[PDB]
Amino acid sequence: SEALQQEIAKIDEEIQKCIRDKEAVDAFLPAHGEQLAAIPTDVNFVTRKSEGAHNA
Amino acid sequence: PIPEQIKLIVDKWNPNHPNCAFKTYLYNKVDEHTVPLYGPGPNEDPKEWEEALQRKPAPNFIPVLCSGFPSIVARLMLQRRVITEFNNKLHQINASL
Amino acid sequence: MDEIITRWATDLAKYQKEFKEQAAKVMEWDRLLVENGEKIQKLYTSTYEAERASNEIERQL
Amino acid sequence: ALFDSLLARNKKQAEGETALGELPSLQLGLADLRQRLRKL
Amino acid sequence: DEDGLISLIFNKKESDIRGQQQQLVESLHKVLGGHQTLTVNVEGVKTKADNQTEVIIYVVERSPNGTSRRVGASALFSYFEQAHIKANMQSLGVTGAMAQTELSPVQIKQLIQNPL
Amino acid sequence: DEDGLISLIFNKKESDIRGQQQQLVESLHKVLGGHQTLTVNVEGVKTKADNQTEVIIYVVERSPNGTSRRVGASALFSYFEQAHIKANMQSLGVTGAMAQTELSPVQIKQLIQNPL
């Protein structure tokens, strides 16, 4: 039962250690998401100011 | 059938690619004439590679192997690294305008 | 001992179904990034043009 | 900044000057303007 | 990129940064390996909040022929973001870093294809 | 640079150079100070014109621990171009000299900034 009970521990520990990385992904998303969503609004804005200069 | 499921689960949660079950491909853009390069590596099934190249969104795109979570983290890392470059260039444009 | 394999497999499928979503989201974000990038370049061109034109008008005046 | 430049241009427009011909034009709007548009 | 400027955010008050600037600069020199062919220079120091300070640096590298030049910003940033180096930086109070170079689309594509 | 080769042009016929090579080599040794820790070696002799001969040399230097190595070409050229040494060389019939090392841009920049 030793090798088994140890093996299950190591395995479940590794999986849990992987899920930590999964969580690490989950954590770094919303911020980056806002940052990303910010972009199209600016380029869609700067493109407008350019049109202003060109019309000027 | 017990020590098979266990080994298969140990195989699923792993970067060795024995049916990793975290197999998704992301297309990285690369201008010609660099398409002939890339060129997978250690444990790439030409099946998956070609099947990725098959449903290609647009030319000059090469698929990229995302096995599990550190890879998607890394993809994010790049995405930020380019985020900042984007904002910078955009601000340059803004300033010149 | 089956009650452990059940947990393992459930967790596996559960987190797989989520990892797929995350990856998909990342892909969509990439698409957004390049889609905008093209426009950024267009802005670079348009801007350079504007710059040159303004310089010309400066020369004219 | 486009509409802004449209205003600015249409602002500088109706304000002089000594250009041998182009005097500032009076602005209408809304009621008179619709009819002025229909009379096109 | 040739100007080599890296902005660092420190979780320290500006007075503390300036008060021990000699020590801070040498610690950054040590993080880089401490060789006499590298010299850390402070471009600017700016308060950002009560306990947040931005420190902009560049690094001058000397060649065997006595020539000197700045380490490119991308190259320097790449060094500082390596996991071991980042950890050492965090021990000095660094909580973030930024380069000014606006990467090309092909550079960005390369970073996304090979995030490590 | 480690090969230490310096090419010298002499305003002498090849037969004259070869005919008195022992003497020529010792005179070069004297120009270097004449110590027993320096040894002039002839790498090659080539006629270039009726009364012009190229002589390629290097100098082996011995350390206090018995170790030997060639004097670097740049270092040796730097010695020979010093005004006093150049004049002594000209008295032996030397009308020019060249090192093979292709200097780096930073080295070249340093030489231009400090031509003396």
Query: Is the distance from CB of E2 to CB of E70 less than 8 angstroms?
Result: yes
Give E91's contacts (C-beta < 8 A, 6+ positions apart).
none
Q: Read out DSSP for chain B?
A: -HHHHHHHHHHHSSTT-SS-S-EEEEEEE--TT-TT-----TT--HHHHHHHHHT-SSTTEEEEEEEHHHHHHHHHHHHHHHHHHHHHHHHHHHHH-
Place of tokens 């690619």: B17
How far is residue D17's CA from residue D21's CA, in Å, rounded to a whole number?
9
Nearest Cα residue to E110 out of B90, B31, C37: B31
For residue F15, what are the CA distances in angstroms to E37, F18, F41?
Answer: 50, 5, 18
Picking from E98, E111, E114, the nearest residue to B82 by CB comes out as E111
Nearest Cα residue to F37 out of F14, F54, F62, F58: F62
How far is residue F22's CA from residue F34's CA, in Å, rounded to a whole number?
14
Query: Is the distance from CB of F107 to CB of E65 less than 8 angstroms?
Result: yes
Residue of E nearest to F101 (CA): E65
**Which of the 8 DSSP states describes residue F11?**
S
Please give the helix or strand (H or E) that residue E59 lies within, else none. strand E52-62
Q: How is residue B40 written in tokens?
A: 């997978």
Pairing mode of beta strands F52-62, F38-49: antiparallel
The interaxial angle of helices A29-55 and A2-27, nearest 10 deg, is: 20
Q: Is the peptide bond before D17 cis (omega within 30 degrees of 0)?
A: yes
Contact between chain E and chain C (3 or more Cβ pairs less than 8 Å apart): yes
How far is residue A15's CA from residue B14's CA, in Å, rounded to a whole number?
9
Residue contacts between B and C (CB atoms, under 8 Å): 60
How far is residue B3's CA from residue E61's CA, in Å, rounded to a whole number?
58
How far is residue F78's CA from residue A4's CA, in Å, rounded to a whole number?
75
How far is residue F54's CA from residue F76's CA, in Å, rounded to a whole number?
17
Cβ-based contacts of F103 with chain E (< 8 Å): 65
How far is residue D14's CA from residue D26's CA, in Å, rounded to a whole number?
7
Interface membership of F114 toward E (CB under 8 Å) = no
**Which of the 8 DSSP states describes residue F37?**
T
Pairing mode of beta strands B61-67, E94-99: unpaired
Greatest alpha-carbon span in chain A:
82
Q: How is residue A29 written in tokens?
A: 């998303």
How far is residue F91's CA from residue F98's CA, in Å, rounded to a whole number?
18
Nearest Cα residue to A51 out of C49, E17, B89: C49
Contact between chain C and chain F (3 or more Cβ pairs less than 8 Å apart): no
For residue F43, what are the CA distances in angstroms to C31, F14, F37?
Answer: 65, 15, 19
Q: From the CA of A39, how many Å to the nearest CA of chain C?
A: 8
How far is residue F44's CA from residue F48's CA, in Å, rounded to a whole number?
13
Cβ-based contacts of E105 with chain C (< 8 Å): 34, 37, 41
Interface membership of B93 toward A (CB under 8 Å) = yes
Cβ-based contacts of A39 with chain B (< 8 Å): 83, 86-87, 90
Q: How is residue F102 written in tokens?
A: 């292709």
List the beta bridge partners of residue E38.
E61
Cβ-based contacts of B82 with chain E (< 8 Å): 103, 108, 111-112
Q: What count of residues does chain E have?
A: 116
Place of tokens 């969503």: A37
Q: How is residue F4 written in tokens?
A: 């230490």
How far is residue B65's CA from residue B53's CA, in Å, rounded to a whole number?
12
Nearest Cα residue to E42 out of E68, E24, E62: E24
Cβ-based contacts of C41 with chain E (< 8 Å): 105
Query: Is the distance from CB of B95 to CB of A47 less than 8 angstroms?
Result: no
List the beta bridge partners of residue F60.
F39, F70
Picking from B68, B70, B97, the nearest residue to A49 by CB comes out as B97
**H-state helical runs in chain E:** 14-19, 21-31, 73-81, 83-91, 105-113
